[PDB]
């Protein structure tokens, strides 16, 4: 196996994205796929146990998605996060956006797309996060 992803989905839209995105993944990635976030401790515990590369959050409440996130890039782990649509969160999702990035790791966020959109989102970043380092620039 080439790395080690953990997929979480909460909510209506998140379970059905995290669904599809695990089907996705290129079998030469460690899935870890989980339903409906409660604990963000016991994620923590599942995300340290797994050894994640990276976590991918997508769905609802947003804080609880934006709390696991974080907890996910405190441990070294690259974080991809889907909200589905809801008004006026720009700028919750900049702030978050900036936080998680103290840590130095990759952060992707995206909002308010369809559920294809999102599944072809998180194919692209875990694509590249899994490119070969034979280029110029460098995270």
Same mark, same amino acid.
């Given at each position: 196996?080439?790395?080690? /992803?953990? %997929? =979480? !989905?909460?909510?209506?839209?998140?379970?059905? +994205?995290?669904?599809?995105? #695990?089907?996705? @993944?290129?079998?030469?990635?460690?899935?870890?796929?989980?339903?409906?976030?409660?604990?963000?401790?016991?994620?923590?515990?599942?995300?340290?146990?797994?050894?994640?590369?990276? /976590?991918? %959050? =997508? !769905?609802?409440?947003?804080?609880?998605?934006? +709390?696991?996130?974080?907890? #996910?890039?405190? @441990?070294?782990?690259?974080?991809?996060?889907?909200?589905?649509?809801?008004?006026?969160?720009?700028?919750?999702?900049?702030?978050?956006?900036?936080?998680?990035?103290?840590?130095?790791?990759? %952060?992707?966020?995206?909002?308010?797309?369809?559920?294809?959109?999102?599944?072809?989102? #998180?194919?692209?970043?875990?694509?590249?996060?899994?490119?070969?380092?034979?280029?110029?620039?460098?995270?």
């Amino acid at each position: 196996m080439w790395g080690k /992803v953990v %997929v =979480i !989905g909460s909510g209506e839209y998140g379970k059905r +994205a995290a669904q599809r995105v #695990a089907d996705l @993944l290129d079998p030469r990635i460690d899935v870890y796929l989980i339903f409906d976030a409660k604990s963000t401790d016991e994620i923590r515990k599942m995300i340290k146990d797994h050894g994640a590369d990276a /976590v991918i %959050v =997508i !769905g609802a409440p947003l804080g609880t998605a934006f +709390a696991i996130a974080k907890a #996910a890039a405190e @441990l070294g782990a690259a974080v991809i996060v889907i909200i589905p649509r809801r008004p006026g969160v720009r700028e919750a999702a900049r702030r978050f956006g900036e936080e998680a990035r103290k840590y130095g790791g990759r %952060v992707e966020v995206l909002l308010g797309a369809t559920v294809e959109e999102a599944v072809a989102f #998180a194919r692209r970043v875990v694509q590249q996060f899994f490119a070969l380092e034979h280029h110029h620039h460098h995270h």
